[PDB]
Amino acid sequence: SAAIYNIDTSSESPDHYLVDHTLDGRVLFPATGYLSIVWKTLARALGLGVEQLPVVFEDVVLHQATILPKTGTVSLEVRLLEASRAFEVSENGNLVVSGKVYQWDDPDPRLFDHPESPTPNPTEPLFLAQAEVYKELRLRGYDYGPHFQGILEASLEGDSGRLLWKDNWVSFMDTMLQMSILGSAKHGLYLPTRVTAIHIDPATHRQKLYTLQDKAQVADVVVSRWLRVTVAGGVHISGLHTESAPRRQQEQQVPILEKFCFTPHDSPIFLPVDDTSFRWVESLKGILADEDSSRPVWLKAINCATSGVVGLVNCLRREPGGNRLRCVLLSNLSSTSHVPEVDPGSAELQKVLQGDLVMNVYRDGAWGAFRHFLLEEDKPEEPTAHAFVSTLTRGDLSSIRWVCSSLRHAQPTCPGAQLCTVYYASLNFRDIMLATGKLSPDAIPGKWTSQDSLLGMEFSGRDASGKRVMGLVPAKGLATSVLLSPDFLWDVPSNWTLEEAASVPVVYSTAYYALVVRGRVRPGETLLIHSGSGGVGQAAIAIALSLGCRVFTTVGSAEKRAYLQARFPQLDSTSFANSRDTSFEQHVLWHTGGKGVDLVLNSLAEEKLQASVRCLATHGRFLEIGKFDLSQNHPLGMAIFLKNVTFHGVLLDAFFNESSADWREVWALVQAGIRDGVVRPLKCTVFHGAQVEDAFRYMAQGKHIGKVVVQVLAEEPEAVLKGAKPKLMSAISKTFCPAHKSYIIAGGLGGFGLELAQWLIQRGVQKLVLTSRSGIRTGYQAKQVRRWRRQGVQVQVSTSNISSLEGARGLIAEAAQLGPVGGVFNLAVVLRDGLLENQTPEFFQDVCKPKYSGTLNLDRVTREACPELDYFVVFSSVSCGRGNAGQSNYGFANSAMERICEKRRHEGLPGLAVQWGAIGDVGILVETMSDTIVSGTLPQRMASCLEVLDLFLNQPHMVLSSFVLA
Amino acid sequence: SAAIYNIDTSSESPDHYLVDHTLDGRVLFPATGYLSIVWKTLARALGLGVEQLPVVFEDVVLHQATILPKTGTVSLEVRLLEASRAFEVSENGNLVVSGKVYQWDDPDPRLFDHPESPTPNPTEPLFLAQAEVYKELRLRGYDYGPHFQGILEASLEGDSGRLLWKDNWVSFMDTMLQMSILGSAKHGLYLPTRVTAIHIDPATHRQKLYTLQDKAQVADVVVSRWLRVTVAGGVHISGLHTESAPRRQQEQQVPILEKFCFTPHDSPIFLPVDDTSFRWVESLKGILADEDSSRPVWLKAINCATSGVVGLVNCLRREPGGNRLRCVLLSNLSSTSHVPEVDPGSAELQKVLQGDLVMNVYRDGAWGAFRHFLLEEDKPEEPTAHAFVSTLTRGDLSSIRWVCSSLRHAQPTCPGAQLCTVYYASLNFRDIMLATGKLSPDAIPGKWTSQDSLLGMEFSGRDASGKRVMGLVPAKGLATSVLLSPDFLWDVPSNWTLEEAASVPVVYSTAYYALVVRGRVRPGETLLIHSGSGGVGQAAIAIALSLGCRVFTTVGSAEKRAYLQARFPQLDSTSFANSRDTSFEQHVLWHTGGKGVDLVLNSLAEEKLQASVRCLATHGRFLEIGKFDLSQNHPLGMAIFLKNVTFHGVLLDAFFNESSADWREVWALVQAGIRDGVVRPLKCTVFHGAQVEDAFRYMAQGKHIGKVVVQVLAEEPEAVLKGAKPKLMSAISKTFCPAHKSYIIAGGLGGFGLELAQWLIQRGVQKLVLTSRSGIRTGYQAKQVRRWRRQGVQVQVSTSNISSLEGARGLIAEAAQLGPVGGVFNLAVVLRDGLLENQTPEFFQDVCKPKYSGTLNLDRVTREACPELDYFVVFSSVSCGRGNAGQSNYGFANSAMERICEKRRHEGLPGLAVQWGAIGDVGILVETMSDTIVSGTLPQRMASCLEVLDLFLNQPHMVLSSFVLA
Ligand SMILES: NC(=O)C1=CN([C@@H]2O[C@H](COP(=O)(O)OP(=O)(O)OC[C@H]3O[C@@H](n4cnc5c(N)ncnc54)[C@H](OP(=O)(O)O)[C@@H]3O)[C@@H](O)[C@H]2O)C=CC1
Ligand SMILES: NC(=O)C1=CN([C@@H]2O[C@H](COP(=O)(O)OP(=O)(O)OC[C@H]3O[C@@H](n4cnc5c(N)ncnc54)[C@H](OP(=O)(O)O)[C@@H]3O)[C@@H](O)[C@H]2O)C=CC1
């Protein structure tokens, strides 16, 4: 009865294509693989083939992921309950997939009709090609191989496209899921966990498939987020639910990060490489012709201080004969104008020749070279008044640090939002779940970036005017300051303390919303509060006892029983039950006469929830404030509703999305309970802001009673202190940008350009000027730019070529039109590869014009008319630091950029040259070349690249490098 | 994997004991049989025995009953999903049982600890013996055989007892269920359909079993209705849910009903049988000694007119020599005193001897006999102003008739209750479900007797003062008059009609409760009403459009669409969707922007409910007014509550149990909607009261739009008609009794006595006087009497022996102390069996004293001091009409009783002699003897006996008989 499927991903195995279903570097069994396997089991059970068996899956739950090992075989057992229409996929006795499967008796082709789009697509010519679709997906973390790369075309919105049919149901339905998650605003690796219904009718699937000019069978796919339905061919997927799988910390991208600083130490053929027309390149070719007399080739850069022949020599030494030519450079790169220029016709040149160093650089009287050093692993910390608590690595409370917040680098001022100095910030159970990784950051409603830390949901402190307030925030409450609407603030009473007030907002708002607004608790109603020792439980007890309600509370220990007895003397011995067992059901049903309770404020889970449901009386109100059974879609028997029972799903976090008068009702309830003495501060276990990690691991164990409070600022003795400024603490430096400043990315439409632009928007950039010679051509560029514009960012796609000084001047002009120029990023690149033999001075000019001349002009115009500039970053290559075969012009342009940035930083101006190794997921190496070893180094992924760039932007080093070794 | 169990109930089969699990004459597979079978499957799967496998069943659902045929074998397949802990019992591919089964890993003996009783048991000596327990159960319809008769002792409350252990888990757990349903107030056959949890730990089961003096292993069982838990031995059953299985109409008890009326036409040994000392019995023995001269044995009854030697001769003729003796009787039973007595010493005796008739009776100048005639099958109909609609046979709309109601024979008058003449009574979907049998009468909340008809939930008419009102009732609304609280009445406005007003109460109260009280609908909220063409749907549309709410309504036809468009012009084309498919989900999610609706008033079922749940918006309120998914305990995925969603189980029928201000809120809402014009009468399809069956079958098909209304009384033109009396219609006569009258059952503590007493309480008897020589001795008697007393009936257990005239006088005195004597029932009997040879005059005296002398004295004292007497019933035997071997004194006493009743009826006084055949389930034949053929006749069951008695009490025949032939 148990159909066995030995999934082998060996080369000769029929299931070898499954190696291409790689998700975060792990070969996982697709959910559609389970669908096909259960389909095959049902077809054998009915004595048919899958192609002759139209099938319906219902309530498919994916309980765990099956990892397909590189060597071995995974055995999946499918058992069918035909009478109950159920199936079960298990692996080694562990339930993998459950749900209902049955033959579609009357298959309706009209089901597989594409739903109309809510809005017509204006950019019909602009779509996502297959390479673009899977570049975006691999950016999200889906490393789909060729067998699972079945999306040829997709619209920019991600609601329509085409899927190639390789006579494979697993791949086709997986590409269905890929197209479903392609038009997703949420970022990260989202995996299917539930599907409400899947109808596969292979008969109409054969009809829906059509052949293109490529002779490849394809099918139109449509995703409707309004109807929650994906249709393609003869497959219909309704109610697909995906949860964000936390990306594994065992990432092989541990980049080598390095620093580039000037470090003091036959017949010679001298070549002046200082000419701006690159006419010497052909001359260098002549020097490469000879063998004996070409041993002392001395290329000297005397005139220009930012010539950058270092990368030239580094790249030419790798060419055949480069070492034999012994290319030795003399770079007179004087950082300051007061330093005397070394005469190359004097004894200094003879001394340099006697030294025979591969590279000689003169810097302010020092004759040295350019060497690579290891970058310090200590994270840059700065003294700021605006910081937040964040877990650097998810799931690890040890990696809990204060990081500079977006309020430090961008101070906002607008009505309807108030900046309050946080003196005390309360931990909540959701904060513990976030910091321990048990809860995904995306599960919290709101617009949160990937780098955003959502720790902290409630605080107390002082507003801008100095008034002593306490506030409730959706997130970012565990900070030195909070930007929140004044609608979520209460005045702290005179008798209260800020320490005390920090425990009221979340807990009492939740209790008031649940009991009064939702539960509509009336005086004298019997009521069961679960975990009455906790914050929300204690508040619910206070509210109920203010109304003279009989309270049955469940506590997990006798000490919590004693605390609740002392705190609420209205509770008697029969008020208390166990929360760690189901016996609270028996206690309640006995002490209530078998009737039940009028309300159940429930945070318990699984069977403990079901027992809580069995504690309900007639007309009982079950207020579910827990999330586990809700998030797991656990079944609730509906017979309880025969008791006139109301079931509330109570989520206070819904009040931060609309903030209408519905929240003001709960606010007024809390304020009234404050003035009536009903709302009373809970017990607060206080950890100082210097040790927030200990607060987290303390509250994680659960021995706490009441509220854990992190004191960010000690409450000074005063009612309304006019200052109200946060004290300066050392927090990890993080790159953030003012919303009033404009930021330019020259070459911002490229792979790294678009990724950097998105990263900058995530860092507060609101005015972007991306420059490209050709403008927006690809559908990926259009989708990214239109998404940023819809998000509210002024993204200008400029054509102003920075190669010309007039072009850079006009570019700075269009940037300043939006706002003062805060940053410029030189990512413009053109490539004219090839060895020195087949190299042209025109090729050198073409390659250096975006980099050499581009950075010349950017530096000049920023010096002239950019007083508020904070960032001057250029993207150089590792081919500059070490050298690449047949990339001499690339290295020369990159070294010129580095010299420019060093010269800028020497005068105190912002300057940064990032030597990037092989860049992954996007760029020129991804398009031209193919996780392939390039020059001994792996392509660094974007996530790692942006992390390293964030680190580099907070360093004092002119030039740093990042590359992942193989 | 599928363990096969071939259940064979043959004599040599190991599962032969299953023949003893008979429920309503059908051998059914016990639910505990499925438990044991799944247990065996799990033990084989784990390679263990059941006795070594502690097991846990969870969420056990019994989807269908398995009938075990007398000849054959039923194959039950058990499949296990060990990974998901599920099991499935199927029969021929049909799901029989589902649920979770798994090994109890850490078995807790403390679980099998008997919960304390809510109240101590005062009557410790008074318990239910095994015979009593199973007599009560077989009265409820559980014909358990000896193998499943494992309850030795049970307390009167039914919450404790002992269960015999026959090394059989099926039988033990079935007796657990029997004891669970023994203390049930609900009557009828209740079968398990769901069990929440079952823990079986055989290890502690062996310890809990103990041996009595009988050397039989037994275990204490405790049922806790407060905790919903039954514990016995090492078995724990929590959350057992039972539904009333409708008793099969294919009942073999089709009694022969008959009438007993006086029908005009060697050496003789004359025996005067008129002596009141029975001294002639021995003389008759002498007449039985001879053979030749004993041929003309002439036993003459001359003095007493109520001698009743007819039964004597009928019983003596069956004795050996009775026919040879040719027992010929001469009964001078003159009905009136003016009739001349026939002289037995004249030519009349010679003529009678020449006729040689077996029996000769002189009645007012007619020389005839007593012959049995067939009773007319036409039900007695009487003209009454108080009738109700009822289905005589459940599930059959053809058997829909008007029956006389309890308001005819008992007119109540008390504050807080009003008697309103019903002019129009509305049918509702629940009424159709009741009359078609799809809905059990017990599913309706309230105190409803077995014979109560619950048809009709709403009416309009006139109150006692004549005011034109409309009312909402829990049941009995389909009547000519309704007794209801004035709290459930509205005044009908002047512009309204009673016809119109009859459609408002149920429909608009439901809509107001759901939308306003429960859903808290706010103006402008999007809202999905299912079946908007129906009554409740139309009312919800009216309420929502009164608030300016956007309405999505689902209708099943285009004609219903057109009707709703014409009726509510605020609905546009996009307001309407299909209710017969799930596509309303797609329509709603499209036309709402994917957000959903704020409310869903749902009456749809199964997947159509789930789609309705998928139509909910954030903070959406799902008001479930349907019952199918609720009653079936269908699963509801809790992920919907992640959307801040509220789920209301809306049941308006809960307002008839408490009737607090919570109902007055809905009442005020309806009244306000009436004065504001929001509440508008629906379309009414009217069937006159003469044809109610056609209204039922019309509304059953579902082509109706609005409300089906039965016009009981045509609305006369007047505002407040002072008369307000219902018109007299012919309704089936039903026995009902005034609450102010006292009723005596002589011998009312016997089997038939207790059953008749319960039947009389169900017919309105509130003052009962049961007489017994020995008083209350058995626990069954105590339980019945205390249940009646707790129900509110004044039950007096008198010892006044009716054999003496003083005793009967005192009995009538204690009866009149409670209230005027409305009825007397002679069920007193003592038996002195044995043939005429071994018969004694003292035996005749003893047997006749409760019957002969008892009815003498009852008749005399009722003639003297019982002017308001309505019933004078005596229970005679079929042994009187035909004759039984060795029961001559019994037949003589029964015939004397019959003569007394005939004499009473001749003077116009109430009189009835019911010749009962073998009586089943209770009585002397059940105790002394054993579905066994007795004298060629089967024992008539109580249900049939009480039905036949109800029929007999409404007849004009002095003596009728009822017996079931074999
Ligand atoms: N890919 C890699 O492995 C490495 C990348 N880098 C750095 O990363 C940056 C981006 O490279 P990559 O990661 O490959 O992503 P891309 O190569 O896709 O982005 C390059 C951008 O440069 C633009 N550009 C080129 N010339 C000009 C010009 N004259 N004016 C305006 N824009 C111009 C291009 O637009 P258009 O041509 O239409 O004008 C393009 O948008 C480069 O600065 C590069 O040095 C460094 C080392 C390695
Ligand atoms: N069982 C059958 O098959 C048949 C029954 N019937 C009728 O059904 C009626 C009851 O018989 P049954 O069905 O067996 O149920 P029961 O025999 O159990 O009820 C008989 C009752 O008569 C009582 N009784 C007897 N003598 C007296 C007395 N002197 N004063 C007061 N009460 C007395 C008994 O109480 P106690 O002795 O303590 O006083 C007992 O409660 C009888 O009238 C009988 O004729 C008729 C035909 C067949």
Those residues whose C-beta lies under 8 Å from the C-beta of residue A31, and which sit 6 or more positions away, are A60, A62, A97, A174, A177, A191, A192, A195
In the residue annotation, A174 being an active-site residue is answered as: yes
Residue A688 pairs with which residues in a beta bridge? A711
Q: How many residues does chain A have?
A: 966
Cα separation, A824 vs A862, in Å, equals 9
Q: How was this structure determined?
A: cryo-EM
Active site residue A619: no
H helix or E strand, kind and range, residue A857: helix A854-865
User: Is the CB of residue A482 less than 8 Å from the CB of residue A502?
Assistant: no
B770, exposed or middle or buried, with CB in 10 Å at 0-12, 13-18, 19+?
buried
**Resolution in angstroms, to 1 decimal, for this deposition?**
2.5
| Per-residue CA distances from A283 to A268, A308, A370, A840 (Å) | 14, 18, 25, 11
Enter the tokens of residue A610. 């079901």
Q: Could you identify the residue written with the tokens 């002699």?
A: B913
DSSP bridge partners of A127:
A155
How far is the centre of ligand 2, averaged over its atoms, from the C-alpha of B744 (Å)?
14
Task: Look up residue A484 and give its amino acid.
Answer: L
Token pair belonging to A87: 């199936």
Comparing C-alpha atoms, which of B730, B780, B725 is closest to residue B755? Answer: B780
Question: How far apart (Å, rounded) are the C-alpha atoms in residues A434 and A44?
Answer: 45
Query: Edge-to-edge strands of the sheet including A381-384?
Result: A381-384, A729-732, A400-404, A387-391
Report CA-CA distances (Å) from A113 to A195, A201, A216, A448: 19, 12, 22, 35
End-to-end CA distance of chain A: 48
Q: Residue A236: phi, psi to the nearest 5? A: -130, 120
Beta carbons of B537 and B530 less than 8 angstroms apart: yes
- Kindly give the interhelix angle for A888-906 and A854-865, rounded to the nearest 10 degrees: 20
- Look at residues A937, A945, A477, A605 and name the one whose alpha carbon lies nearest to residue A756: A945
Q: Atom 20 in ligand 2: which residue has the minimum CA distance?
A: B750
Instruction: Count Cβ neighbours within 10 Å for each residue of A161-180 and write b for 16 or more, e otherwise.
Output: bbbbbbebbbbbbbbbbbbb
Task: Return d(Cα A350, Cα A399) in angstroms, integer.
Answer: 55
Query: What DSSP string describes B816-871?
Result: HHHS-EEEEEE---------STT--HHHHHHHHIIIIIHHHHHHHHHHHH-TT--E
Contacts with B, A 789-828, CB within 8 Å: none
Q: Please answer whether residues A461 and A420 qualify as being in contact, where contact means their C-beta atoms are separated by less than 8 angstroms.
A: yes
Instruction: Return d(Cα B961, Cα A402) in angstroms, integer.
Output: 98
- The closest of A202, A191, A147 to A36, measured between CA atoms, is A202
Q: How many CB atoms lie within 10 A of CB A31?
A: 26
Sign of CA dihedral B21, B22, B28, B30: negative
Contact criterion met (CB below 8 Å) for B89 and B78: yes
Pull the structure tokens for residue B372.
């049995």
Q: Give dist(CA A354, CA B365) in Å, integer.
A: 167
Cβ atoms of A448 and A441 closer than 8 Å: yes
Does the C-beta of A779 come closer than 6 Å to ligand 1? no
Query: Going by C-beta distance under 8 Å and a sequence separation of 6 or more, which residues neighbour residue A609?
Result: A602, A624, A626, A629, A634
Measured at the CA of A512, the angle between CA A507 and CA A517, to 5 degrees, comes to 145
Distance, in Å, from the CA atom of A71 to the CA atom of B540, rounded to the nearest integer, reads 64
Nearest listed ligand to the Cα of residue A925: 1
Give the separation between CA A226 and CA B588, rounded to whole angstroms: 10
Strands B821-826 and B871-877: parallel
Tell whether A94 lies on the interface with B, counting CB pairs under 8 A: yes
- Residue A707 corresponds to which amino acid? K
- Of A794, A747, A709, the residue nearest A893 (C-alpha): A747
Decide if A487 contacts A410 (C-beta within 8 A). no
Residues B817 and B592: their CA atoms lie apart, in Å, by 72
Both tokens of residue B953?
């009490």
- Report the distance separating Cα A756 and Cα A738, nearest Å: 16
d(CA B284, CA B277) in angstroms, rounded, equals 14
Q: Are B464 and B420 spatial neighbours (Cβ–Cβ below 8 Å)? A: yes
- The CA-based angle B13-B15-B16, given to 5 degrees, is 70
To which residue do tokens 């006084």 refer?
B909
d(CA A232, CA A210): 12
Q: Of A93, A624, A637, which is closest to B633 when you measure between CB atoms?
A: A637
Specify the DSSP class assigned to residue B380: P
Q: What is the rounded distance in angstroms from the CA atom of residue B108 to the CA atom of residue B102?
A: 15
The distance of Cα A517 from the centroid of its chain, to the nearest Å, equals 36
Distance (Å) of CA A133 to CA A7, A141, A232, A779: 28, 12, 17, 10
The pair of three-digit structure tokens given for residue A856, joined into one six-digit string: 């010349």
Task: Of A382, A403, A380, A683, give the one whose Cα is nearest residue A542.
Answer: A683
Residue B666 CB neighbour total at 10 angstroms: 22
Question: Pick the catalytic residue: A15, A159, A174, A629?
Answer: A174
In Å, what is the CA distance from B524 to each residue of A319, A786, B543, B565, B599? 76, 34, 12, 19, 11
Q: Which residues contact B48 (CB under 8 A, 6 or more apart)?
A: none
Helices assigned H by DSSP within A252-362? 280-289, 309-316, 322-325, 347-355
How far apart (Å, rounded) are the C-alpha atoms in residues A758 and A756?
5
**Can you name the residues that pair with A122 across neighbouring β-strands?**
none
CB of A24 closer than 8 Å to CB of A143 = yes
Secondary structure (DSSP) of B529-555? EETTTBHHHHHHHHHHHHTT--EEEEE
- Tell me the C-alpha distance between B253 and B934, whole Å: 15
* Backbone φ, ψ for residue B896 (5° rounding): -60, -40
Q: By C-alpha distance, which of B843, B711, B806 is closest to B315?
A: B843
Instruction: List the structure tokens of B137.
Output: 């159960």
Q: Name the residue with the closest Cα to ligand 2, atom 7.
A: B875
A505 within 8 A of A458, measured Cβ to Cβ: yes
DSSP string over B58-126:
EEEEE-SPPB--SSS-EEEEEEEETTTTEEEEEETTEEEEEEEEEE-SS--GGGG-PPPPSS--S-SS-
Q: Which of A827, A833, A851, A856 to mutate to test the pocket of ligand 1 (most atoms within 8 A of CB)?
A: A827
Evaluate whether B861 touches B809 at the Cβ level (below 8 Å). yes
Find the CB nearest A629 among B84, B635, B638.
Answer: B638
DSSP category for residue B725:
P
- Write the single-letter amino acid at B650: V
What radius of gyration do chain B's Cα atoms show? 33
State how far the Cα of B185 lies from the Cα of B654, in Å rounded to an integer.
19
CB contact at 8 A, A247 and A286: no
Classify residue A93 as exposed, middle or buried by CB count within 10 Å of its CB (0-12, 13-18, 19+): exposed
Cα dist from A396 to A189, A478, B687, B956, whole Å? 20, 17, 75, 93
Nearest residue to A769 (alpha-carbon basis) of A706, A830, A816 = A816
CB–CB of B55/B200 below 8 Å?
A: yes
What crossing angle do the helices spanning B535-546 and B505-512 adopt, rounded to 10°? Answer: 50
Q: Known binder of ligand: residue B114?
A: no
Reference B425, options B456, B390, B466; nearest CA is B456
Residue B613 per-residue DSSP state: H
Distance between CA atoms of residues A763 and B198, nearest Å: 58
Burial class (CB in 10 A: 0-12, 13-18, 19+), A867: exposed
Phi–psi pair at B395, nearest 5 degrees = 85, -5
- Sort strands B742-746 and B821-826 into parallel, antiparallel or unpaired: parallel
Cβ pair B886, B915 in contact under 8 A: no
Question: A608, A618 in Cβ contact below 8 A?
Answer: no
Closest CA to A391 of A692, A701, A702: A692
The DSSP call for residue B668 is H
Report whether residue A33 contacts ligand 1, using a CB cutoff of 6 Å: no
**CA B538, B539, B542, B544 torsion-angle sign:** negative
Instruction: Compute, in degrees rounded to 10, the torsion defined by CA atoms A755, A760, A761, A765.
Output: -150
Residue nearest to atom 23 of ligand 2 (CA): B747
Q: What's the DSSP call for residue B934?
A: B
If phi over 0 gives left and psi between -120 and 50 gives alpha, with beta otherwise, what is residue B533? alpha
Exposed, middle or buried, B222 (CB in 10 Å: 0-12/13-18/19+)?
A: buried
First and final C-alpha spacing in chain B? 48
Is there a contact between B238 and A607 (Cβ–Cβ < 8 Å)?
no
Find out whether the beta carbon of A617 lies less than 6 Å from any atom of ligand 1.
no
- The domain in which residue B111 lies consists of 3-244
Judge: A586–B632 Cβ closer than 8 Å, yes or no.
no
| Residue among B749, B885, B757 nearest B829 (CA) | B749
| Integer Cα distance of B745 and B951 in angstroms | 19
**Candidates B83, B594, B644; nearest CB to A651:** B644
Q: Compute the distance between CA of residue B544 and CA of residue B528 in angstroms, rounded to an integer.
A: 10
By C-alpha distance, which of A586, A585, A630 is closest to A608? Answer: A585
CB atoms inside a 10 Å sphere around CB A710: 28
Distance CA B648, CA B519 (A): 8
CA A693 – CA B956 distance, rounded (Å): 95
How many angstroms from the chain centroid is the CA of residue B602? 33
- The first and second tokens of residue B760, run together, are 């009389």
Place of tokens 């290319």: A327
The total of other beta-carbon atoms located within 10 Å of residue B71's CB is 7
Is the CB of residue B21 less than 8 Å from the CB of residue B144?
A: yes
Q: Which ligand is nearest to the CA of B825?
A: 2
- Give the C-alpha separation, A814 to A770, whole Å: 11
Determine which helix (DSSP H) or strand (DSSP E) holds B937, and give its type and residue range.
strand B937-938
How distant is the Cα of B635 from the closest Cα of chain A, in angstroms? 5
Task: Characterize A502-515 residue by residue with b for buried, 16 or more Cβ atoms within 10 angstroms of its Cβ, and e for exposed.
Answer: bbbbbbbbbbbbbb
Nearest to B469 by CA among B297, B663, B671: B671
Q: CA B62 to CA B23: how far, in whole Å?
A: 16
**Phi–psi pair at B595, nearest 5 degrees:** -75, -45
> How many residues can be counted in chain B?
966
DSSP B161-188: EEEE--S-HHHHHHHHHHHHHHT-SS-S
Pick the residue whose CA is nearest to atom 41 on ligand 1. Answer: A750
> Distance between CA atoms of A686 and A689, rounded to whole angstroms?
9
